[PDB]
C-alpha cells in the first residue's frame, strides 16, 4: 500500500483521491494519504476553498516512483513532485505515519468501483494524451483544451485525445458515403481499432480516461471525447460481442458513479438516446440502459 506525503496544507482545499474527497482547512496539520492500493492508476485532485474555479489534479501510478505534494505559493497550486532520495522519502513517511498525520484511502473491501472505472487505463497512455515527459505523473485541469478542440491554443497544455470526426475522409470511404456514415463499423474496426488503437483495451482505456477527466475536472473536451467514443461503437452494426459486453459494464459503472447533480451538463441527451434506443446497439447495453432509466429518466 503506497502513500502520497504532503509537505503541508497552507491553503484550505478539498482534496480528492480517486472517487473519495475530504476537506482540509488552512494550515491544518495534514501530511497526506496512506494505504493507497497498488496496481491501479490513481488521481489526486484539488478544489481550493477560495476559488471553486479551476479543479486540477495529477494522474499517477505508485509503481513508477515516490511522489509527494508541496504547495507552491508562487503558482498558487499544490504541485506533485517526485522524491529521488528514497530513504529521505521513507523516513519522512514513517514520521508522518507515526504522528497519524495522514488520511487513509478508505477503500471498502467489497468495493470494486475504482477498478471498474480504470480497468483499461494505463499510465503510459495517459502520458501520451498528456504530454509532459519530464514527469512520471500527468497534470489535468478544468480548462485544458483538446487537440480536436484547438483545430476549430497553447499546444503544450493540450489533451491529445485521438481525433474522431464522423464527417471526415478518415471516417468515410470514397464510394461508401451513405454506407460508412450510417454504419460506422469500417471506421471503428479498421481505421480506429486495427489502425490507431491496435486493440480494444487501448480504446476503452482512452474512453475511461476521458470520462474520468470530465467527471473530476469538468473538462468539456474530455466529455466530448467520451461521448464520441461511445457513439462510434453504438453507431456500428458490427462490433465484437466481447467489446459490447465490456462497454455495457464500463458505462454502467461510469453512470453509477457520476454525481447525480452533474448529469445535466455531463450527459449528452442525443448521444444517449441514440445509443440506448435507436442505434444498432440499442439492445446490447442492458445494464447501462437499466441504470440510466432508474437514475436519469428525465434525460431520456
Partner 1 sequence: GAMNSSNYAELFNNDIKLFVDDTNVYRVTVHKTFEGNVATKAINGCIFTLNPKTGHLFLKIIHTSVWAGQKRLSQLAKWKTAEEVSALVRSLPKEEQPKQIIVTRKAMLDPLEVHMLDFPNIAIRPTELRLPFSAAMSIDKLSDVVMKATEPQMVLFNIYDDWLDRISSYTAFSRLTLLLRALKTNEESAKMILLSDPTITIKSYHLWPSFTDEQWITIESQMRDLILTEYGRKYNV
Ligand X SMILES: COC(=O)c1n[nH]c(C)c1Br
Chain residues binding ligand X by CB under 6 A are 5, 7, 68, 70, 83, 88-89, 92-93
15/55 Cα distance (integer angstroms): 10
Contact in structure between 139 and 130 (CB atoms under 8 Å): yes
User: Smallest distance, Å, CB 151 to partner 1?
Assistant: 13
Of residues 63 and 88, the one with the C-beta less far from ligand X:
88
DSSP-derived letter for residue 99 is T
169 binds partner 1 (CB under 8 A): yes
Which residue is it, cell 508541496?
Answer: 70
By CB neighbour count within 10 A (0-12 exposed, 13-18 middle, 19+ buried), where does 80 fall?
buried
The option from partner 1, ligand X, none interacting with 92 (CB < 5 to 8 A, set by class) reads ligand X
> Cell digits for 179?
454506407
The option from ligand X, partner 1, none interacting with 169 (CB < 5 to 8 A, set by class) reads partner 1
Of residues 108 and 178, the one with the C-beta less far from partner 1:
178
The binder of partner 1 chosen from 21, 95, 168, 238 (CB under 8 A): 168
Closest by CA position to 14, among listed 1, 26, 31:
26
171/236 Cα distance (integer angstroms): 12
The binder of partner 1 chosen from 26, 50, 177, 293 (CB under 8 A): 177
Which residue, judged by CB position, is nearest to ligand X in the bound state? 5
Of residues 84 and 169, the one with the C-beta less far from partner 1:
169
Contact in structure between 93 and 5 (CB atoms under 8 Å): yes
User: Smallest distance, Å, CB 89 to partner 1?
Assistant: 55
167 binds partner 1 (CB under 8 A): yes
Q: What dihedral do alpha carbons 11, 16, 20, 22 form, nearest 10°?
A: 0
Of residues 95 and 238, the one with the C-beta less far from ligand X:
95
Of residues 82 and 248, the one with the C-beta less far from ligand X:
82
Amino acid at each position: 500500500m503506497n502513500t502520497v506525503p504532503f509537505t503541508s496544507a497552507p491553503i484550505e482545499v478539498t482534496i480528492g483521491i480517486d472517487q473519495y474527497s475530504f476537506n482540509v482547512k488552512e494550515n491544518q496539520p495534514f501530511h497526506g494519504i496512506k494505504d493507497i492500493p497498488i496496481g491501479h492508476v490513481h488521481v489526486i485532485h484539488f478544489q481550493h476553498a477560495d476559488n471553486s474555479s479551476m479543479r486540477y489534479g495529477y494522474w499517477f501510478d505508485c509503481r513508477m516512483g515516490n511522489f509527494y505534494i508541496q504547495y507552491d505559493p508562487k503558482d498558487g497550486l499544490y504541485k506533485m513532485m517526485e522524491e529521488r532520495d528514497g530513504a529521505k522519502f521513507e523516513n519522512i513517511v514513517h514520521n508522518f505515519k507515526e504522528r497519524q498525520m495522514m488520511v487513509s484511502y478508505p477503500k471498502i473491501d467489497e468495493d470494486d468501483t475504482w477498478y471498474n472505472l480504470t480497468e483499461f487505463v494505463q499510465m503510459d497512455k495517459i502520458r501520451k494524451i498528456v504530454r509532459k515527459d519530464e514527469n512520471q505523473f500527468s497534470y489535468v485541469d478544468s480548462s485544458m483544451t483538446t487537440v480536436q478542440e484547438n483545430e476549430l491554443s497553447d499546444p503544450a497544455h493540450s489533451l491529445n485525445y485521438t481525433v474522431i470526426n464522423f464527417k471526415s475522409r478518415e471516417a468515410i470511404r470514397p464510394g461508401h458515403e451513405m454506407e460508412d456514415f450510417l454504419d460506422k463499423s469500417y471506421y471503428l474496426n479498421t481505421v480506429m481499432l486495427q489502425g490507431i488503437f491496435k486493440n480494444s483495451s487501448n480504446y476503452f482505456g482512452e474512453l475511461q480516461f476521458a470520462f474520468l477527466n470530465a467527471m473530476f475536472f469538468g473538462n468539456y473536451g474530455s466529455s466530448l471525447q467520451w461521448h464520441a467514443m461511445i457513439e462510434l461503437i453504438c453507431s456500428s452494426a458490427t462490433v465484437p460481442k466481447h467489446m459490447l459486453d465490456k462497454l455495457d459494464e464500463i458505462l454502467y459503472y461510469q453512470i453509477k458513479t457520476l454525481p447525480e447533480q452533474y448529469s445535466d451538463i455531463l450527459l449528452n441527451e442525443r448521444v444517449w438516446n441514440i445509443c440506448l434506443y435507436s442505434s444498432f446497439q440499442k439492445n446490447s447495453l442492458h445494464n447501462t440502459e437499466k441504470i440510466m432509466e432508474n437514475k436519469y429518466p428525465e434525460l431520456l
